[PDB]
Design a protein around this ligand. Structure first.
Ligand SMILES: Nc1ncnc2c1ncn2[C@@H]1O[C@H](COP(=O)(O)OP(=O)(O)OP(=O)(O)O)[C@@H](O)[C@H]1O
Ligand SMILES: [Ca+2]
Lengths: 139, 374
């Protein structure tokens, strides 16, 4: 049923613990997400920073994804062919951290967060594969 | 045989380190050269192996047109960079690449196309079941049992500073400096040649180098060691040439390594080892910085100069805010750190829920590296 279909599809693995489809085109809005998690709370200010003008400041300060302080690792969100940006959450004292990869499409931003011990490459390929499906349906 | 046996291949610009994942040392260290037979005029024949490689082509020399395939960590020629790989399996470990997964090692800032090329080759050409490309510096930090930190890699042709967050290199803050072994060798020569020690070349450049590895140390205070140098004699060391004299260096011992911290010594405008390390860190996220400053690992031959730790420990402390604990970590085995790192990485069951499988190369192609390998 709706965008919720793509989500269920994204978590069905047991590897991810959060997904979300967010429209960034001039009126940010989560189109569907794992409920009761973090991405569901992504705000327009936050989304306005990922799809930003400068691709440098967040390297120093960082950025939150639903109030979650994330450290950018690689940034290729605006670069053709790639379409991906990779992040690692920022815990506190032994608290475990998780990788997140947001991939842009014509209209959407596909976010994906791994569980405990899932390598970023996994989460990237996966979030990437899905973004290409929307990307081919003019989405 | 009695298990999956993943392999590790740490590709140095000079020395190639092969081995089976799970070992104590590269179970094969050979030069990275490909001799391409010759003589000229165009002859009566030449014979076997249109290309000789490794330790064998090394003797050959006078008969073969010796070639260096990798420069500054970066692959220069795939034809002969393939030969070295081919050899590693079919000549060194004597394994059929077809049955062993493999970790390939790479340089910070390896161009995209090089990555893909490396991928298409391992899969289409050697038919590896699965592989994974890891940055040489990340593996070194693992070798010292860490995941977050900053590696100062100094081999022969260049130095890089790689701030790593949880096992992920942060490219935006990776810094590269054109000083490393070679430079220290050319300086020392130029500085030994002062009392007309004139080594220069007649196979005499390798003597400077052996002095460098054997007699150079690093000063905690240049000026003051300089003053005590001039006051003389428990700092003046001698060296025996092959055929001949017992030579003497003094000021020279702690002067060549000092160009690391002072590249104007080498006529070059450039920040030193210390400030470079510092610059990378500033480029990082404010929240991890304090954990980079207390995890500056050293790897590479050029880091082996005794005293480099303390001079490092002291020099960064004056550049940085007091709020953190500068703690230069410099592992005793920092020459083989990189291989040992990947040996450890390619030993874990996780390496399997981490790599590119042939199936994946068939569905996606070489571009699958920009995805999986970070
Ligand atoms: N024990 C030592 N003390 C001081 N300097 C050393 C020592 N061992 C090696 N070196 C020097 O530091 C460098 C070591 O780098 P390394 O052995 O990694 O080089 P390589 O494989 O020839 O090339 P590249 O580093 O460009 O990949 C060389 O220039 C070497 O002369
Ligand atoms: Ca080297």
């Amino acid at each position: 049923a709706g965008w919720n279909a793509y989500i269920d599809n994204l978590m069905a693995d047991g590897t991810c613990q959060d997904a979300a489809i967010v429209g960034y085109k001039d009126s940010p809005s989560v189109w569907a997400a794992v409920p009761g998690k973090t991405f569901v709370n992504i705000t327009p200010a936050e989304v306005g920073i990922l799809v930003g003008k400068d691709r440098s400041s967040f390297f120093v300060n960082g950025l939150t994804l639903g109030g979650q302080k994330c450290s950018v690792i690689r940034d290729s969100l605006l670069q053709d062919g790639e379409f991906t940006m990779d992040l690692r959450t920022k815990s506190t004292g032994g608290a475990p951290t998780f990788n997140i990869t947001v991939t842009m499409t014509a209209k959407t931003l596909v976010l994906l967060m791994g569980k405990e011990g899932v390598h970023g490459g996994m989460i990237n390929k996966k979030c990437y594969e899905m973004a290409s499906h929307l990307r081919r349906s003019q989405y | 045989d009695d298990d999956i046996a993943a392999l590790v291949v740490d590709n140095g610009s000079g020395m190639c380190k092969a081995g089976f994942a799970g070992d104590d040392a590269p179970r094969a260290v050979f030069p990275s050269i490909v001799g391409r037979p010759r003589h000229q005029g165009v002859m009566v024949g030449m014979g076997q192996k249109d290309s000789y490689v490794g330790d064998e082509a090394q003797s050959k020399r006078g008969i073969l047109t010796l070639k260096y395939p990798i420069e500054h960590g970066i692959v220069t020629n795939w034809d002969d960079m393939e030969k070295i790989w081919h050899h590693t399996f079919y000549n060194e470990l004597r394994v059929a690449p077809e049955e062993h997964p493999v970790l390939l090692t790479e340089a910070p800032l390896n161009p995209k196309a090089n990555r893909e090329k490396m991928t298409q080759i391992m899969f289409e050409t050697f038919n590896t079941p699965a592989m994974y490309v890891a940055i040489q510096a990340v593996l070194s930090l693992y070798a010292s049992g860490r995941t977050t930190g900053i590696v100062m890699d100094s081999g022969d042709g260049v130095t890089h500073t790689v701030p790593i967050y949880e096992g992920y290199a942060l490219p935006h803050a990776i810094l590269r400096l054109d000083l490393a072994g070679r430079d220290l060798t050319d300086y020392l020569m130029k500085i030994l040649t002062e009392r007309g020690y004139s080594f220069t070349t007649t196979a005499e450049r390798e003597i400077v180098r052996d002095i460098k590895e054997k007699l150079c140390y690093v000063a905690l205070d240049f000026e003051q060691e300089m003053a005590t140098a001039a006051s003389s004699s428990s700092l003046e060391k001698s060296y025996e040439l092959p055929d001949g004299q017992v030579i003497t260096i003094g000021n020279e011992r702690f002067r060549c390594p000092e160009a690391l911290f002072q590249p104007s010594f080498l006529g070059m405008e450039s920040c030193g080892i210390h400030e470079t390390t510092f610059n990378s860190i500033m480029k990082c996220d404010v929240d991890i910085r304090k954990d980079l400053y207390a995890n500056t690992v050293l790897s590479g031959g050029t880091t082996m100069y005794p005293g480099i730790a303390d001079r490092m420990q002291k020099e960064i402390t004056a550049l940085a805010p007091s709020t953190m604990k500068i703690k230069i970590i410099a592992p005793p085995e920092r020459k083989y750190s990189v291989w040992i790192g990947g040996s450890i990485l390619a030993s874990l069951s996780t390496f399997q829920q981490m790599w590119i499988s042939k199936q994946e190369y068939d569905e996606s192609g070489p571009s699958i590296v920009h995805r999986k390998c970070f």
